[PDB]
Design a protein around this ligand. Structure first.
Ligand SMILES: [Zn+2]
Length: 267
């Protein structure tokens, strides 16, 4: 069934008054941005599903920041693409017209935010946000590097050497009289989700009259808990992906290829 109609699609898109846009790894990967919870591209000597766990920060905090210094870093040179932008501009327009567009995004790169998207829901946090592991405070952090110690430390290559920066040298909360060890405020495997962020997610799913999916779909994680709700209520689901045919899900629309291509036109 999954219609291939940018025709009718453009019909509902003109009709619908509260669009919710679930964003995917793909959207970020079309930029220049490094996926790791991905097929290949390990980061040095370890699995990245394996560095991004709470016990990693427990056994070597140093070499995890090592992993996220890099992350934070690499994106100095990466930009929002035509997808990030189509979506942004579409938000603005109908914004003053008189309609809500929302963007739900598992990604942590903040590329949507650079593109000018105001309604963002990053359901894994940002790697430009820190959490003090002591007085769980949260904070925009953009400093390059994050800690003098980490300057030059983080090398992509393998057989790179460790770093083993004494905890005390790692990122430390500036909160007056705290100084606990800073971690990345980014949802880890085994880790759960901002329940607030979820009750808004779920909120914008009951009230949405148009739903979009881009990058990584309803068949593949992290993206699923959101596909099911839309279909039952009686609401159309356009899926925009780069995954040719391999799949386990279908709905009112599917399109193909980069969302650089498609989206600009669509929205
Ligand atoms: Zn603190």
């Amino acid at each position: 069934r999954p219609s291939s109609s940018m025709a009718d699609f453009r019909k509902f898109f003109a009709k619908a008054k509260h669009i919710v846009i679930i964003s995917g790894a793909g959207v970020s990967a079309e930029s220049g941005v490094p996926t790791f919870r991905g097929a290949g591209g390990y980061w040095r000597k370890w699995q990245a599903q394996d560095l991004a766990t709470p016990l990693a920060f427990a056994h070597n905090p140093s070499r995890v920041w090592e992993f996220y210094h890099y992350r934070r870093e690499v994106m100095g040179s990466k930009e929002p693409n035509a997808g990030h932008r189509a979506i942004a501009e579409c938000e603005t327009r109908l914004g003053k017209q008189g309609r809500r567009v929302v963007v739900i995004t598992q990604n942590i790169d903040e590329l949507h935010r650079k593109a000018g998207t105001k309604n963002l829901l990053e359901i894994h946090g940002s790697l430009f946000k820190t959490r003090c592991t002591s007085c769980g405070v949260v904070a925009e952090n953009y400093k390059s590097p994050i800690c003098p110690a980490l300057s030059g430390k983080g090398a992509p290559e393998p057989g790179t050497q460790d770093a083993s920066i004494p905890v005390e040298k790692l990122p430390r909360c500036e909160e007056a009289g705290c100084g606990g060890l800073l971690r990345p405020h980014v949802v880890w495997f085994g880790e759960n989700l901002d329940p607030a962020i979820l009750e808004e997610v779920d909120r914008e799913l009951a009230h949405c009259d148009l739903c979009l999916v881009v990058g990584t779909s309803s068949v593949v994680y992290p993206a699923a808990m959101f596909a099911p709700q839309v279909a039952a209520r009686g609401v159309p689901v356009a899926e925009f992906n780069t995954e040719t045919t391999p799949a386990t899900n279908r709905f009112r629309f599917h399109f193909q290829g980069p969302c650089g291509t498609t989206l600009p036109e669509a929205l």
